[PDB]
């Protein structure tokens, strides 16, 4: 099992260092790919390490910028970015296959998100959203959040049923806002609770809010 | 080294055979390999040795192809399977992949649920009020809505989103926000936002007025 680590926000031009910790036994044969993928691209291959020695491949993007490390007995393995653009705004991945000798089997994790701009850290202002005959809709609106990512499971997974949440839009003011909603039923008076369920990862800012009319 | 990959984008309803080709820019033998990524989770390996598959994969997907021509066939087509597909070349000391296909399902028109959500007392003595029009379960994505303020209709205020198609009724949901300030809010009365689609055959409006 892979899980990236070390992501957030970095100005451009300086830089970041991102971990990938595997879990199991260790091979020599074994190695490291890192993958990353733009906000609403296709996947780009950026390099791998090969533990068997002093091989490694990057890719002419990143040739001569990004330097990959590892220590055995921790088994995790670095990736320190510099001289960072914008162009390099991305959720970066490490991953492993069998089909080439890198890993037991074909391992990701679940990507950690870098963002390169200026812009600083800022944590989410939530606002209810009043339903007041008919299924009704509900729903906790995020706005002034930087940077992504953010997330929300209503009642904490308790009532996750028909929840649409909504892609990030970015204000020209340069602050992400999106919003979340669940059809309940019509006359649904007196519920249990409806609890905001959202957290901030950049900035520890894990908000609850009330839904009533 | 560059895989050309096509189509770029391509809809069909459940049962369908689905064909997405990957042409190599040069001899790759048979070292290709197909993942799935669907919206905000990592990629999933589909294929490898070009037909080889995958264990957990089911025997509806299926590859073939050697030299610089290879395809990946979805012989019937499920709802959950819509996702992103990528080729990737592993023949030497780096990995060039493929440029996605993006895979979405046709299904007989929904009508869009409207509804109509006032800015909070909150989001008010912050100074900038913000109203949402929200339109619920329907297909295809093209929806207008227009917003309304004291019968005027408002432009370069609003902006929306759209969410990925919905793993199980395959149908999208619109959001649209409309931005002003305090006392441009306070200083009107009426607003709606009118929404068409091709479900709906008159144009449904919802409303409210800021006070009741």
């Known amino acids: 099992k892979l899980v990236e680590s070390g992501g957030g926000v970095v100005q451009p031009g300086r830089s970041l260092r991102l971990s990938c910790e595997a879990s199991?036994?260790?091979?020599?044969?074994?190695?490291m790919h890192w993958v990353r993928q733009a906000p609403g691209k296709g996947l780009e291959w950026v390099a791998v390490?090969?533990?068997?020695?002093?091989?490694?491949y990057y890719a002419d993007s990143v040739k001569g910028r990004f330097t990959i490390s590892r220590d055995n007995s921790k088994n995790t393995v670095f990736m320190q970015m510099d001289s960072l653009r914008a162009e390099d705004t991305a959720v970066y991945y490490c991953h492993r296959n069998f089909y080439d000798g890198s890993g037991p089997f074909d391992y990701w994790g679940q990507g950690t998100l870098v963002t390169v701009s200026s812009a600083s850290t800022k944590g989410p202002s939530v606002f209810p959203l009043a339903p007041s005959g008919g299924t009704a809709a509900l729903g906790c609106l995020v706005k002034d959040y930087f940077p992504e990512p953010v997330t929300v499971s209503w009642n904490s997974g308790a009532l996750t049923s028909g929840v649409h949440t909504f892609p990030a839009v970015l204000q020209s003011s340069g602050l992400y806002s999106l919003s979340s909603v669940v059809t309940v039923p019509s006359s649904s008076l007196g519920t249990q609770t409806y609890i905001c369920n959202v957290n901030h990862k950049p900035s520890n800012t894990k908000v609850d809010k009330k839904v009533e009319p | 080294i560059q895989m050309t990959q096509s189509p770029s984008t391509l809809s069909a309803s459940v049962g369908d055979r689905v064909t997405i080709t990957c042409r190599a820019s040069?001899?790759?033998?048979?070292?290709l390999a197909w993942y799935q990524q669907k919206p905000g989770k990592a990629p999933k390996l589909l294929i490898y040795k070009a037909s080889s598959l995958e264990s957990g994969v089911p025997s509806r997907f299926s590859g073939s192809g050697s030299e610089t021509h290879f395809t990946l066939t979805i012989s019937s087509l499920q709802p959950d399977d819509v996702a992103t597909y990528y080729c990737?070349?592993?023949?030497?000391?780096?990995?060039?992949f493929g440029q996605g296909t993006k895979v979405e399902i046709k299904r007989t028109v929904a009508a869009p649920s409207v509804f109509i959500f006032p800015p909070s007392d909150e989001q008010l003595k912050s100074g900038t009020a913000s109203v949402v029009c929200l339109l619920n379960n329907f297909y295809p994505r093209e929806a207008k809505v227009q917003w309304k303020v004291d019968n005027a209709l408002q432009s370069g205020n609003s902006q929306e989103s759209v969410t990925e198609q919905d793993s199980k009724d395959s149908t999208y949901s619109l959001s649209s926000t409309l931005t002003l300030s305090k006392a441009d809010y306070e200083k009107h009365k009426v607003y709606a936002c009118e929404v068409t689609h091709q479900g709906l055959s008159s144009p449904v409006t919802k409303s409210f007025n800021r006070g009741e």
């Open positions: 990737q070349e592993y023949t030497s000391y780096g990995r060039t």
């Open positions: 390490i090969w533990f068997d020695g002093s091989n490694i």
């Open positions: 199991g036994f260790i091979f020599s044969t074994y190695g």
């Open positions: 040069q001899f790759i033998s048979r070292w």
